[PDB]
Amino acid sequence: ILVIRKGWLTINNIGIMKGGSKEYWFVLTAENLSWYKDDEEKEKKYMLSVDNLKLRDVEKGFMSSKHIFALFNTEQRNVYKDYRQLELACETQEEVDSWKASFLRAGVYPERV
Amino acid sequence: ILVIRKGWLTINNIGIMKGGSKEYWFVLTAENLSWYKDDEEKEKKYMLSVDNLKLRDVEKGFMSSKHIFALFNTEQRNVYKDYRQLELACETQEEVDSWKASFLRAGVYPERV
Amino acid sequence: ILVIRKGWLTINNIGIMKGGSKEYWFVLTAENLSWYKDDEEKEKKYMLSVDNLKLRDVEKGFMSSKHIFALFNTEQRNVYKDYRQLELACETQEEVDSWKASFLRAGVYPERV
Amino acid sequence: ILVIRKGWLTINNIGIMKGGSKEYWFVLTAENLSWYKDDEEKEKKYMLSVDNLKLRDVEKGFMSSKHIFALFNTEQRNVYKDYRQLELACETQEEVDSWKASFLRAGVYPERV
Amino acid sequence: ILVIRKGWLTINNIGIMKGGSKEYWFVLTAENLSWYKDDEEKEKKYMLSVDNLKLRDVEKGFMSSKHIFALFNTEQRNVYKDYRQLELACETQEEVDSWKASFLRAGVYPERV
Amino acid sequence: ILVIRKGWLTINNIGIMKGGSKEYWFVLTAENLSWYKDDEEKEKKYMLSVDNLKLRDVEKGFMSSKHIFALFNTEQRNVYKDYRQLELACETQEEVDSWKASFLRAGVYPERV
Amino acid sequence: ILVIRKGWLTINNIGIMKGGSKEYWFVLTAENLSWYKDDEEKEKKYMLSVDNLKLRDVEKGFMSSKHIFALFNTEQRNVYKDYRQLELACETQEEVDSWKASFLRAGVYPERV
Amino acid sequence: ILVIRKGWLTINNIGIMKGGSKEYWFVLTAENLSWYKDDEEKEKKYMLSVDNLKLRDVEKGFMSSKHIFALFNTEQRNVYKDYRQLELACETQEEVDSWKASFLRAGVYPERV
Amino acid sequence: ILVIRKGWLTINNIGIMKGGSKEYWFVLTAENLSWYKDDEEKEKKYMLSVDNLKLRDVEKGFMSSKHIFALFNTEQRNVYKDYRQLELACETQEEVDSWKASFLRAGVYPERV
Amino acid sequence: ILVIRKGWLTINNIGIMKGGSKEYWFVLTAENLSWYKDDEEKEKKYMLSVDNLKLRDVEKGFMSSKHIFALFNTEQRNVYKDYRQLELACETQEEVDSWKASFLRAGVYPERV
Amino acid sequence: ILVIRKGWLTINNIGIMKGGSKEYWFVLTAENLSWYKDDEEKEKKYMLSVDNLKLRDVEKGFMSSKHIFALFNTEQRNVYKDYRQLELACETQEEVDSWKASFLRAGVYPERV
Amino acid sequence: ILVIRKGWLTINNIGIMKGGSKEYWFVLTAENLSWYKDDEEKEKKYMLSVDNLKLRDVEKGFMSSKHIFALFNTEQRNVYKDYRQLELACETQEEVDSWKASFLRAGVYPERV
Amino acid sequence: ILVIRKGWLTINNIGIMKGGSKEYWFVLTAENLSWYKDDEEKEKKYMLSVDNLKLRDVEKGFMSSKHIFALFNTEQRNVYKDYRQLELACETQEEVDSWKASFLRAGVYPERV
Amino acid sequence: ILVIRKGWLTINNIGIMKGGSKEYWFVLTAENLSWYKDDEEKEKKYMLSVDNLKLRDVEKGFMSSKHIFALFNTEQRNVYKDYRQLELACETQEEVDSWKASFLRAGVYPERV
Amino acid sequence: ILVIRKGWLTINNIGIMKGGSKEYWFVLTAENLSWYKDDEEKEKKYMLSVDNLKLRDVEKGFMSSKHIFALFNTEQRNVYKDYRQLELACETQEEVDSWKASFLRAGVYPERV
Amino acid sequence: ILVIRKGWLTINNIGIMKGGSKEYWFVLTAENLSWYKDDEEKEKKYMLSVDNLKLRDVEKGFMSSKHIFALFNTEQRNVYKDYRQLELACETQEEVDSWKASFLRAGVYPERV
């Protein structure tokens, strides 16, 4: 497999008193987006397929620094587990645009309609 | 007693510098909703009666992941202690709908009017 | 690790030589689905890995009031023992619907009916 | 001095990376409102005079549980140090009304105009 | 554990053989209601468990300016000693009303008058 | 170099699961704004030039205590690294006005247009 | 403990027998106001407690461009040594105004002119 | 310390005597830009400090489909070895654009073309 | 909570109608003694509370090489189901002796033979 | 803060008009010595500060089997109320001796007999 | 039951990476020695009978401050669980002698032979 | 593989400012002794072969509670890595004897000579 | 009072699960030795008189770095509270000799006999 | 993770077509052995996994003063590239001996010569 | 400078309530032994000259795992600051011998006499 | 950071034009030696870096009872101002000797007399 990008991304919507909102190490390929506990890639948390994934800018509206985008399955109501979208937060819009650009190489395109 | 459901739920409106917003282990029966410190059910925090309880979706409006619903007493201004409603937060709307469905089995129905 | 839900379910496809469809106490986590004789959890009949499990709606089933669904391993014939699929029943449809939302959370998705 | 009330109250607007938003033990008399680190009243943080103090409900608007009121000096732009108002947070509106009522006994009345 | 409130209250129903109605210093927590001779807390007259206590409005009472309310154990004759109910008085109605909100917080609810 | 001002300021938009929103010790001169880990000025985090910097009040709108202003480069889309503006938070508006005034001495003027 | 501000100020009322008005390096905290010969802080001329200090606008002063203000102990004749009040000057009015906001923060309020 | 990004890039200006332009695996942090023979990171060809580096658009370059950009030390002739500038290429423009946003984050800004 | 020991033991007194004496996988904690069909722990035959259990040496037993000991509830007839005592066997005496030391640790003491 | 000891002691010098010498439940800390009617601690007769207290052996006392010792304030006439010294008795000498070691720990030293 | 003594004591020989060497709240009566997590006596850790208990000074030899004594069963090799003796540590020899004296009242006498 | 024993054991001689002296979950078979981070056996720290292993009681001499034994290779100076022996600590001698007994079943015998 | 010395010293024999072995800020004068929580001397822990104090080297024998000396009262068995000696630990013998020398100036001389 | 040692070693068996035996900068951890051109670590020639590596004394070697040893994979022909074994040399025997102790620590044991 | 060795070593005799016994990153050359906070060598704690240094095995006698050696100045009573020797602890004797060997290359020889 | 010692010392070589030898209050840390007019620390005469300082015994000095020593910068003419060396005096030799041990601790070593 060819790696399109590896980097840190905060998972914004899968956090509470269980697993608090954390930052994971993501590895994007043309076929999957996996995340690990750290860049040593010793503990893998999940491997999501890029099939039917689109990208959308989340409700960044709340006056906070975090810049959010979200991946979703156009052929399903839930992207993974019982989540509608996988929200991914970054520190800047530049970083978000940067990642958006990498996703195009994986076949993950901006919201269809 | 027959248990309708046991699971974790975050108490959203009973938290501050005293007891911080925590997640408790809830046990729902046809007659009560009790919560414990953990699933070992060794330390019981409270036992609330299902009498006159209705269910309502809380001000989820704040751009956050938490999905909230709330239980209330239709024959009283306060559900327990000095709280108007008992706010219960979940990670997804699916989880909230899931719990809403269990409550119907306890006689706790969506907001009357 | 975290328990997703505990609740009673009827196993609809237990052999004649074991009473037939009986109600058992289920415990679901992100890794396994275990069932006990009761909520005291002194006797665990089985613990099935959440791995490769998918979920399907069982064509009505017996001539009863039960609403059925079933678990099946996407990669093999039997799901556990010599069973093909584990048939679960609920006296109500919304009960089946709340459990379907919980399985999603453990990663057990529908389809492949 | 006669004590009108002693209890815990969260100081909402005097917190950051210095002193984080904390809960202090307040002692209200007819002439002052002092706060300590704890109910042992060993470490006194401040003693504010009730002279020219009025009371007002703070921007509780943010979808959170905290219920806030605030004290201010009608003959000055700053109540203490460089703060416009002293924001005091509680867990319920009942608790806030409860404290509002105690303040009337100290000569601290609801916002004049 | 956490102290809900400390403040003076008049015990309206103390026997002739103890001065009659005297003012005592109360300390309320989620577990007990204790009263001292004064705010130095050197002499505690009593500590009553918050268990099974409910609250009722006392039919005006004596021919005075006092506003009365009383505590009574829902499950027994006497509330403490040989008392039936503990009569508490305040020179103002709002004073009684602020204390009623504090008792709710300890779980002492009204009715059963 | 002549120091115009030294003091603590919270960096509001450069924080996440990496470096959490922190408070640093800032040293402003007529030519630069540097920040250190602490007032001992042993660990320097950065040195920003005052060239082409303007000042603007950030989206303080979110009902919180923090009062924010932000510095930006009028001849560039990014002030430093990949940040549009450097958000600096204070406890009061007085503190913000206080710092605004110091910036004028450095040639950092309120938003041009 | 926390340093509120460090910056140069001119002491306007230093005796003829000490050069006259000289600029010194000030360090303000919530407890003291100290002044050094320079920003290296090798020689501290004095450390004045923030206790009982108040602030007044000095009637223009000398026939210069300096904007003056002064510190005085509300409870005594001299503020330090044999001084009555400590006269501080700034070449600009806004400079005096930023420092006035910092003193407020240490609790040094105006009036008593 | 924190890894900003890992991804393949083509070094466009490698000498004839080393295969010519080859693709290498880059790792960027706030301090260095390192390149390996591949993503297993067993052989690091070089580690270049982010210090004094700036970024320029390379005048199209060869007669190919590659989009080029280059790194150069603002304070010296060679960027590494005897190179002047390190030419990096991407088959797409948006690929170059995502990497430019990542370099900004490490402090490598454009211009000086 | 803490697991004291996991190891195989033969239950010597299982009824003819269940194969007879079979080896099961035991898990001992300070609260319970559970036995599974094997070390994968998919099927728990039983979980017996450590409460009131004592330990006795079983008068040799069958005409075999097994060394037997048994658990019995000091306060009742049956130890579990309709059993009186749970007979455990080991092919060696030291094996029985190591297990006796582990039970002591869970509080199961000898005597009452 | 830390409780040094809790145990019954007989107050030997209680006035005729209070039953005479009665046994009370004592609680000693490094700051106070409190006595209750019993170990439930519902009624505290008194709380005496450990300040300036010293300890003396009481000249045998009454014609009984009690071993007496007493507490007295080194700086005043009465130790509490109108008492001079608080006489404490134990049926055994070693009982008095264990309590003397506990008082030392709270700083109440012997002598001044 | 009559309480001989309540106080804090460190359990010296039941600690490791499981439960670290802790200090518990002990309650000694003529028939048992129980210990709790704290002086609120809400969580009881154990209740040991005083039957056949003797007392002995442990290997205090190690140059440390802790002063140790130990209780043991003369009619058994183990006092509780799999422990030979229950080691109890104190801060001073005085404290140890103090507790030794209390034990005599419980029938726990110094080592027999 | 047949498991002889699973349980917790403290590794006494492989700890310092790197990995502090920890407790691991050990699994002993007839051919190996492996240890994991916990009883979930998800993270395996090491797998040691039982070949040429003998057992010896370590320098328990230091007046501490820990009871130590150690495994060693008779055909080598080092048992694993650069360690002479693998020291394993327990809470009691009973626990140590208990484990010694299990080791005999693995072919690990008491020190040869 | 004239201060002979101020510095940090570890109290070696007054520590356990209550107050752990801590380091305090000591102030020695010709008449007392006081210690505070820190060098700000805001929280005073104790003030010991130098009357009848001698100095002795404690059981430094235990192979540790700490160098210990101890103060004692020659006219008493206990120096303060229920402690025989006040053990003070230092990092080097030089530091201990250094402090010994300062004590001579306070009238605290090496062990008499 | 933890670095075991960093130091120069001569690779004795580098091909003629690479200068021959050259000295390289080694970094050993419990997982890999990496070598750089120098101690600045800008160019890593290789990173070899500690897996399956063993160590042997190389039969003197060349007619020089070098003391040689070599690393070889117990489970394969080549250790890295087309090498069979990695020959390492030191000008002194004790130098080889210190490195052998470090490899043991990473688990590289001798023999299989 | 040529580096003889870099690695971690615990400083055993410079630790207390100030800087606790820590592990530092040491860099040994033919002329100095420096230590840093970590292997990034960003924060240097000290640089000691190898002049007149000898090596000696410290009082390892205390039954602990740590293996200690110590460096000292033969022409002085103190090696650095007020320390007689610089104690360096390791996990094994092998590690200590390993480091001893490296020191010989620096001119640091075993204790002279 | 940590204060090594605070104590009075006489500066023996202060010029005639400043009273001559006066006693000042010294504060020594591992970085600086500061002296104040007194122990209130309101006026710091100077703060000298511990850098390059060494210590020498001053050839008796004046015809007095003072024991002198002096600080001098090994790398320059003056130690502070136009002084060459800072002469410090003590009325006793042991006083000088205790201070010499403290300076060592800050790294100020003797010799170069």
For residue D110, how many C-alpha atoms fall within 13 Å in the half-sphere facing its CB? 6
Element spanning O98, H or E: helix O93-104
Distances (CA, A) of N82 to H41, N72, N77: 19, 12, 9
Nearest chain C Cα distance for residue B104, angstroms:
9
Residue carrying the six token digits 């094994």? O92
Chain B and chain D share a number of CB contacts under 8 A equal to 38
Contacts of C44 in chain I (CB under 8 A): 42-44
Domains of chain F, residue spans: 1-113
Does residue N82 come out as left (phi exceeding 0), alpha (psi in the -120 to 50 range) or beta?
beta
Distances (CA, A) of G14 to G33, G35, G50, G84: 16, 13, 20, 12
Spatial neighbors of P20 by CB under 8 A, at least 6 apart, are P14
Contacts of P55 in chain M (CB under 8 A): none
Distances (CA, A) of L59 to K84, L12, L52, L56, L62: 20, 11, 22, 10, 7
Spatial neighbors of F82 by CB under 8 A, at least 6 apart, are A91, A92, A94, A95, H101, H104, H105
**CA K11/CA I63 separation, integer angstroms:** 47
Tokens matching residue L19: 């990995």
Tokens matching residue B98: 């899931």
P1-113: CATH number: 2.30.29.30
Residue of M nearest to J101 (CA): M82
Burial pattern D60-98, b for ≥16 Cβ within 10 A else e, equals beeebbbbbbbbbbeeeebbbbbbbbbbbbbbbbbbbbb
DSSP state for residue I77 in the 8-state scheme: S
Element spanning A34, H or E: strand A32-36
Are G43 and P41 a contacting pair at CB < 8 A?
no
What's this structure's resolution in Å? 2.2
Coil/strand/helix, residue N36: strand
Chains D, E in contact: 3+ Cβ pairs under 8 A? yes
Contact status of P46 with chain G (Cβ, < 8 Å):
yes
Q: Are H53 and H70 in contact (CB under 8 A)?
A: no
Contacts of L19 in chain O (CB under 8 A): none
Chain M and chain P share a number of CB contacts under 8 A equal to 43
Pairing mode, strands E109-110 and E53-57: parallel
Contact status of J3 with chain M (Cβ, < 8 Å):
no
Chains that touch C (3 or more CB pairs under 8 A): A, B, I
Nearest chain J Cα distance for residue M81, angstroms:
4
**CA O2/CA E108 separation, integer angstroms:** 78
For the four alpha carbons of A16, A19, A24 and A26, in that order, the dihedral sign comes to negative
Q: Where are the beta strands (DSSP E) in chain G?
A: 3-11, 22-29, 32-36, 44-49, 53-57, 67-73, 86-90, 109-110
Tokens matching residue C41: 């959890």
Tokens matching residue M88: 């003070």
Contact status of D18 with chain G (Cβ, < 8 Å):
yes
Are G106 and D81 a contacting pair at CB < 8 A?
yes
Distances (CA, A) of I13 to C42, E25, I5, O11, O74: 19, 67, 22, 60, 76
Tokens matching residue D24: 């202090």
Nearest Cβ partner for O4 among N4, N7, N102: N7
Element spanning N98, H or E: helix N93-106
Q: Are J27 and J6 in contact (CB under 8 A)?
A: yes
Residues facing residue N56 across a β-bridge: N70
- Chain P interface test: which of M4, M5, M67, M96 (most P C-beta within 10 Å): M5
**CA I88/CA I76 separation, integer angstroms:** 19
Residue of G nearest to P45 (CA): G43
Are G47 and P43 a contacting pair at CB < 8 A?
yes
Residue carrying the six token digits 């469905």? B101
Are J105 and M18 a contacting pair at CB < 8 A?
no
- Chain J interface test: which of M81, M83, M86 (most J C-beta within 10 Å): M81
Spatial neighbors of H10 by CB under 8 A, at least 6 apart, are H21, H22, H23, H24, H66, H88, H89, H90
**CA H37/CA H23 separation, integer angstroms:** 8
Element spanning I94, H or E: helix I93-106
Element spanning F67, H or E: strand F67-73
Chain H and chain N share a number of CB contacts under 8 A equal to 17
- Chain L interface test: which of I98, I99, I100, I103 (most L C-beta within 10 Å): I98
The count of residues in chain K is 113
Coil/strand/helix, residue C60: coil
Does residue G107 come out as left (phi exceeding 0), alpha (psi in the -120 to 50 range) or beta?
left
Q: Are A55 and A9 in contact (CB under 8 A)?
A: no
Contacts of C105 in chain A (CB under 8 A): 81-82
Rounded to the nearest 5°, which phi and psi values hold at J111?
85, 180
Residue of K nearest to I3 (CA): K18
For residue P89, how many C-alpha atoms fall within 13 Å in the half-sphere facing its CB? 19
Q: Single out the residue of P23, P37, P32 nearest to residue P80, CA to CA.
A: P32
Are A101 and H105 a contacting pair at CB < 8 A?
no
Contacts of D39 in chain E (CB under 8 A): 3
Residues facing residue P86 across a β-bridge: P71
Distances (CA, A) of D13 to D46, D87, F71, J54: 15, 6, 24, 48
Contact status of P16 with chain O (Cβ, < 8 Å):
no
Contact status of K106 with chain M (Cβ, < 8 Å):
no
Contact status of L94 with chain I (Cβ, < 8 Å):
yes
Residues facing residue N6 across a β-bridge: N27, O6
Nearest chain G Cα distance for residue F4, angstroms:
6
The count of residues in chain G is 113
Element spanning D97, H or E: helix D93-104
Chains that touch N (3 or more CB pairs under 8 A): H, L, O
Residue N66: CB atoms within 10 A of its CB come to: 19
Nearest Cβ partner for L92 among K12, K18, K82: K82
Q: Single out the residue of P9, N29, D96 nearest to residue O6, CA to CA.
A: N29
Tokens matching residue E39: 């705010």
Distances (CA, A) of O27 to K102, N29, O35, O38: 59, 16, 6, 11
Q: Are E89 and E66 in contact (CB under 8 A)?
A: yes
Rounded to the nearest 5°, which phi and psi values hold at G108?
-90, 105
| Distance in angstroms between the alpha carbons of the first and the last residue of chain A | 31
Residue of M nearest to P105 (CA): M95
Contact status of O64 with chain L (Cβ, < 8 Å):
yes
Chains A, B in contact: 3+ Cβ pairs under 8 A? yes
Rounded to the nearest 5°, which phi and psi values hold at O57?
-75, 120
Distances (CA, A) of E16 to E11, E19, E90, I19: 12, 6, 20, 80
